[PDB]
Amino acid sequence: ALVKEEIQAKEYLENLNKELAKRTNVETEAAWAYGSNITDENEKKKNEISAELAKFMKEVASDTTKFQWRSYQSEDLKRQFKALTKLGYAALPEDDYAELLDTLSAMESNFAKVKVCDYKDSTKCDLALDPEIEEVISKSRDHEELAYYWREFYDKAGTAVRSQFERYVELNTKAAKLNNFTSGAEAWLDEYEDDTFEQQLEDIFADIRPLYQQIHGYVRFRLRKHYGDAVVSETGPIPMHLLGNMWAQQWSEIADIVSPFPEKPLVDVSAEMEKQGYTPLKMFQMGDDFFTSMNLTKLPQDFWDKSIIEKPTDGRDLVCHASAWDFYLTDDVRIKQCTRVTQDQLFTVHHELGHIQYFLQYQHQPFVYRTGANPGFHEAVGDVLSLSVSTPKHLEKIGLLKDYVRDDEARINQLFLTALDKIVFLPFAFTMDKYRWSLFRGEVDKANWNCAFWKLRDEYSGIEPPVVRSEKDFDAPAKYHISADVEYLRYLVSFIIQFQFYKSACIKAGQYDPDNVELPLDNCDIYGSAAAGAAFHNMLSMGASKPWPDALEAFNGERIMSGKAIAEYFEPLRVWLEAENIKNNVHIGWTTSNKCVS
Ligand SMILES: *[C@@H]1O[C@H](CO)[C@@H](O[C@@H]2O[C@H](CO)[C@@H](O[C@@H]3O[C@H](CO[C@H]4O[C@H](CO)[C@@H](O)[C@H](O)[C@@H]4O)[C@@H](O)[C@H](O[C@H]4O[C@H](CO[C@@H]5O[C@H](CO)[C@@H](O)[C@H](O)[C@@H]5O)[C@@H](O)[C@H](O)[C@@H]4O)[C@@H]3O)[C@H](O)[C@H]2NC(C)=O)[C@H](O)[C@H]1NC(C)=O
Ligand SMILES: O=C(NC(Cc1ccccc1)P(=O)(O)[C@@H]1CCC[C@H]1C(=O)N[C@@H](Cc1c[nH]c2ccccc12)C(=O)O)OCc1ccccc1
Ligand SMILES: *[C@@H]1O[C@H](CO)[C@@H](O)[C@H](O)[C@H]1NC(C)=O
Ligand SMILES: *[C@@H]1O[C@H](CO)[C@@H](O)[C@H](O)[C@H]1NC(C)=O
Ligand SMILES: [Zn+2]
């Protein structure tokens, strides 16, 4: 009978979860070694261990059918069993799985090994994205130099892996169908446990889109005054290489030329960090300080002993796109970041430590629950702190911002600066997965794959390549997450929900009151707030033990993903910007791009 079986099932899960942590530890160690040191030997080791774990997962999924788990009384037990039935890529036949792993490492290693030649010196051909190319894209205001680096990078990181990407799409689809999802789109969306999730995001995006159009319009106007109308047209999509980022995902790097009030202060603390002798170690210690100040968990000794926080100075190849690592034991958590001493990197450190904090908060949970409530939650944690770190309030406290007068004009500058990071990103993030979903779902013919990418970038973001592209190019994998097969919707979700978290954390900290002019949301610092920390502990400690609305409820009593909070934060900017665009007769919207030839 079922009563006795459910008792046996509980013991089965308890033992199996422990076995899964231990087996995954081994896979994670091999993946860490490869990411830290790209070699053919390490590639082989990583992929062989994964193949072994996949084989065990197949046996696990098979064993779940021996339990009448759908008949059980315990929602908790049922939730754990359901999690075990979900094989993902491990559902593929042995050979197909091995081919997929080979395809994935081929794409990640290609991305990591990209080197271009110096614009001024065709002899020097050892410039990597991190840090050499990214430095030029962010700092150069020479549009031809910018276009050179754009083309060189996209050709090498994107086009070079078209055939691999094609095989990846095929195997991803085969895997999804073996799990009885329609495609990889549905497989990814399953992580949000909500059949209306896509529509919810369409609705929120539609609400924020008009504000994005205004920012777009204003930035284009300002870029015309800098580069001239030969480079930037009034009515067309913005040439993306002028936006301070290789993928135009955030535009904060060009704030100095597009800021609302150029004669007023613009927060840029990179120079002060260098002046005060900041190091990657100091930055991480400061991040640790922020979490502990909120009564959250201190970084364990394993973290300091084992993390890589600076780019290695030997000749080795490695993945320099930052990552946080859970090894599924106790306190064995790690970061690999090629850290630089900049304002942006200080935020990145806090983002990374948000992942690490989540690992520590839920490490007592059964293995299947040791992940985010949904992927967006994991990405949001560190950003909530970064929002307060970025405030003039906090930056003055740590002596990085000097002689600052927070008048109305300085406030608009700061809000705009934040919008260039937070609002601008929304259409970008949506398109990363809208694109891959359409390929996964078989909605785009292979002959149209490249211009399908640029069409979305045009439609949603109103940006375009600096030069004419065609179906002879393949540009999507020039973005890390696309080469590395990392779902991107998590970041769109994060950028929305992080303002729900921030607003509530600020209210809890007594740092935000909508009726108190002295406590604006955009200058809230949650540093040292145990009350804000309590909310985080209540939520993060749950891991994936409950559907995400219950985790949100544990934080602030709400159960609904909402764009209300992000709109609330940016409302003073919206009012000012709508008026400024009218005052300057700023053209809003864009004609269809001519930069991708069919
Ligand atoms: C994705 O969807 C797939 C369907 O599109 C699905 O594939 C199906 O999985 C079924 C298992 O759940 C499987 O059903 C079995 O069928 C066997 C015979 O099928 C053969 O002939 C078919 C032609 O008619 C072919 O198409 C097949 O390829 C096969 O060759 C049966 O022998 C088998 O039966 C046994 O098991 C049932 C299970 O009973 C349940 O559990 C307990 C038993 O302890 C019961 O008390 C309880 O009431 C409950 O019913 C027993 O009742 C029975 O006595 C036998 O022991 C079973 O029906 C099916 O064949 C398979 N394919 C298809 C095309 O349907 C995938 O599993 C899905 N994948 C995922 C990951 O979810
Ligand atoms: O390490 C990562 N992940 C990252 C990348 C990665 C994923 C999978 C394998 C390997 C690596 P990253 O998001 O820290 C990560 C590394 C630094 C920035 C982050 C990023 O990619 N951000 C996005 C979005 C973005 C751009 N600018 C910003 C600024 C602030 C927040 C996000 C953001 C990007 O495109 O780079 O994941 C840890 C994890 C484990 C288990 C569950 C959940 C999470
Ligand atoms: C990189 O890996 C090689 C073998 O693949 C190993 O011999 C070497 O020690 C590693 N290098 C570093 C710097 O760890
Ligand atoms: C710190 O957190 C602990 C539990 O983690 C809690 O019991 C304690 O009240 C918190 N300290 C403060 C000052 O709130
Ligand atoms: Zn992250």
Swiss-Prot record:
Q: How is the cofactor bound?
A: Binds 1 zinc ion per subunit.
- Please state what the protein is called: Angiotensin-converting enzyme
Where expressed (tissues)?
Expressed in vesicular structures in spermatocytes and early spermatids (at protein level).
Gene that encodes it: Ance
* Cofactor(s) required for function per UniProt: Zn(2+)
Instruction: Please report the organism this UniProt entry assigns to the protein.
Output: Drosophila melanogaster
Q: Which GO terms describe its molecular function?
A: carboxypeptidase activity; metal ion binding; metallopeptidase activity; peptidyl-dipeptidase activity
- What modifications follow translation? Glycosylated.
Q: Where in the cell is it found?
A: Secreted, Extracellular space
As recorded in UniProt, its EC number(s) are: 3.4.15.1
Write out the residues that bind Zn(2+): H351, H355, E379
Q: What is its main location?
A: secreted
What InterPro entries does its record include?
Peptidase_M2
Name the catalytic site residues: E352 (proton acceptor), H481 (proton donor)
User: Per the record, what phenotype accompanies loss of this gene's function?
Assistant: Male flies are sterile.
